[PDB]
Amino acid sequence: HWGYGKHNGPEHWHKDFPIAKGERQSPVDIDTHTAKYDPSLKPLSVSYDQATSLRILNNGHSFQVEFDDSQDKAVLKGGPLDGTYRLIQFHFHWGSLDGQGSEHTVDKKKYAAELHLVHWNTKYGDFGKAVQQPDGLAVLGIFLKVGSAKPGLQKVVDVLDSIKTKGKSADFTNFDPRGLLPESLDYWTYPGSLTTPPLLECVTWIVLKEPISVSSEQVLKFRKLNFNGEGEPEELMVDNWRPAQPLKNRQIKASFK
Ligand X SMILES: O=S(=O)(O)/C=C/c1cc(Br)ccc1O
Residue 33 counted as an annotated binding residue = no
61 catalytic per annotation = yes
Minimum CB separation of residue 139 from ligand X in Å reads 4
Parallel/antiparallel/unpaired status of strands 105-106 and 253-254: unpaired
- Please choose which of ligand X, Zn ion, none residue 144 contacts, taking the beta carbon within 5 to 8 angstroms, the exact cut-off set by kind: none
Residue 125 Ramachandran class (φ > 0 left, ψ -120 to 50 alpha, else beta): left
Residue 81 Ramachandran class (φ > 0 left, ψ -120 to 50 alpha, else beta): beta
C-beta separation of 209 from 188 below 8 A: yes
Site for Zn ion in 102-161 (CB under 5 A): 116
Minimum CB separation of residue 103 from Zn ion in Å reads 7
Minimum CB separation of residue 93 from ligand X in Å reads 8
First-to-last C-alpha distance (Å) of the chain? 43
- Please choose which of Zn ion, ligand X, none residue 104 contacts, taking the beta carbon within 5 to 8 angstroms, the exact cut-off set by kind: none
Which residues on neighbouring strands pair with residue 203, listed in sequence order? 137, 192
Residue 34 counted as an annotated binding residue = no
Residue 14 counted as an annotated binding residue = no
Minimum CB separation of residue 241 from Zn ion in Å reads 9
Residue 119 counted as an annotated binding residue = no
CB atoms within 10 A of CB 123: 14
- Please choose which of ligand X, Zn ion, none residue 89 contacts, taking the beta carbon within 5 to 8 angstroms, the exact cut-off set by kind: ligand X
H or E, element range at 230: none
Q: Which of 12, 14, 61, 104 is catalytic?
A: 61
Give the residue with the Cβ less far from ligand X, 141 or 211. Answer: 141
- Please choose which of Zn ion, ligand X, none residue 88 contacts, taking the beta carbon within 5 to 8 angstroms, the exact cut-off set by kind: ligand X
Phi, psi (rounded to 5 degrees) for 160: -60, -35
Give the residue with the Cβ less far from Zn ion, 38 or 60. Answer: 60
CB atoms within 10 A of CB 1: 7
Minimum CB separation of residue 115 from ligand X in Å reads 9
Residues binding ligand X (CB under 6 A): 88-89, 116, 118, 139, 194-196, 203
Give the span between the Cα atoms of 189 and 193, in whole angstroms: 12
Which residues on neighbouring strands pair with residue 30, listed in sequence order? 106
Residue 253 lies near Zn ion (rule: CB under 5 A) = no
C-alpha angle 246/35/74, rounded to 5°? 90
Catalytic residue IDs:
61
Give the annotated binding-site residues for substrate.
195-196
Interaction site with Zn ion (CB under 5 A)? 116
Give the annotated binding-site residues for Zn(2+).
91, 93, 116
